[PDB]
Design a protein around this ligand. Structure first.
Ligand SMILES: CC(C)(COP(=O)(O)OP(=O)(O)OC[C@H]1O[C@@H](n2cnc3c(N)ncnc32)[C@@H](O)[C@H]1OP(=O)(O)O)[C@@H](O)C(=O)NCCC(=O)NCCS
Length: 307
């Protein structure tokens, strides 16, 4: 019936979960647990920022992971039933995996911080770019991307829904490519304010590195199925999960097919377990019978729990 789905970069705000925190002590206990693993106050980070800082990826990832795990902990605390299916967008997949009980929360926390770092350090800032292409079909974008590439690297990285695709690579090629896409009938190429071209070829070297760290973290069997970004496959072999984390890094995030798979899968509703409404917003664009809501405020937490 329902799945939990988990956001990643983009969903951060300074202030996030404040309200939940006031009604649920475990939100802060939770940030405390992670703060003690990062060696700084992560709650204070999210609450006070600044943004500039909270938006740097090696802190964002840990903050979002933490929000999500916190909100999940609330669900269970209140005798929330376990979802049938989870998915997590980009960094989201890590949260999924924690709540599915595959990676322990504190390993995850250090993990996604290291990830951040490998990521940031694989491309020098102002080197790369991401853009959101509103309103073209997938293949005209591939094509756009291919002709704009001109020796550099650009390609679609986020298949978010039909008529929303993110692309990324060398700043210039992104430029060429957005233009192309506009040529080709797109409503919008809207430039995205991110350093890091996640999920294209340029993250390869980060991911090599990420494999090494992963290889030290124990990966247990999922208690719930987790549809992964990279294959839209529900792996159980931790070694296979690990392998998919690694390729997530340099391969497109298949969100659209993933939400589809879970409709195809039985699921009638999707709760966004983390700050923001982004996965919520996309859902009906993918399957408009499907319904979506965020579990990141208390009325809504309460409201969902009553069913
Ligand atoms: C970019 C963003 C914020 C857009 O979501 P929303 O703002 O909720 O979209 P809305 O503004 O509600 O949708 C309407 C507008 O978007 C456009 N649009 C959005 N999805 C569309 C789709 N699938 N097909 C065609 N047009 C679409 C238009 O419909 C436009 O209408 P108007 O010109 O009349 O405003 C969201 O998709 C997002 O956060 N994406 C980031 C995903 C990602 O890669 N994150 C990593 C870090 S950036």
């Amino acid at each position: 019936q329902f799945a939990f789905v988990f956001p990643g970069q983009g969903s951060q705000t300074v202030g996030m979960l404040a309200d939940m925190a006031a009604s649920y002590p475990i939100v802060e206990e939770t940030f405390a647990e992670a703060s003690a693993a990062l060696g700084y106050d992560l709650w204070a980070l999210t609450q006070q920022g600044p943004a500039e800082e909270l938006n740097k990826t090696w802190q964002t990832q840990p903050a979002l992971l933490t929000a999500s795990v916190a909100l999940y902990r609330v669900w269970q605390q209140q005798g929330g039933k376990a979802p049938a299916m989870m998915a997590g967008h980009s960094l989201g997949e890590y949260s999924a995996l924690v709540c599915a009980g595959v990676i322990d929360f504190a390993d995850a926390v250090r993990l996604v911080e290291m990830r951040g770092k490998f990521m940031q350090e694989a491309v020098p800032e102002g080197t790369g770019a991401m853009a959101a292409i509103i309103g073209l079909d997938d293949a005209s974008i591939a094509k756009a991307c291919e002709e704009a590439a001109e020796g550099q690297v650009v390609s679609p990285v986020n298949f978010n829904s039909p008529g929303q695709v993110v692309i990324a690579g060398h700043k210039e090629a992104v430029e060429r490519a957005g233009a192309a896409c506009k040529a080709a009938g797109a409503k919008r190429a809207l430039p995205l304010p991110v350093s890091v071209p996640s999920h294209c070829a340029l993250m390869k070297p980060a991911a090599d590195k990420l494999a090494v760290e992963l290889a030290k973290i124990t990966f247990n069997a999922p208690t719930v199925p987790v549809v992964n970004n990279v294959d839209v496959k529900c792996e159980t072999n931790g070694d296979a999960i690990r392998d998919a984390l690694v390729r997530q890094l340099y391969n497109p995030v298949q969100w659209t097919k993933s939400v589809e798979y879970m409709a195809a899968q039985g699921v009638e509703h999707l709760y966004e377990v983390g700050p923001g409404k982004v996965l919520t917003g996309l859902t009906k664009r993918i399957v408009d019978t499907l319904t979506a809501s965020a579990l990141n405020e208390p009325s809504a937490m309460a409201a969902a729990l009553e069913l």
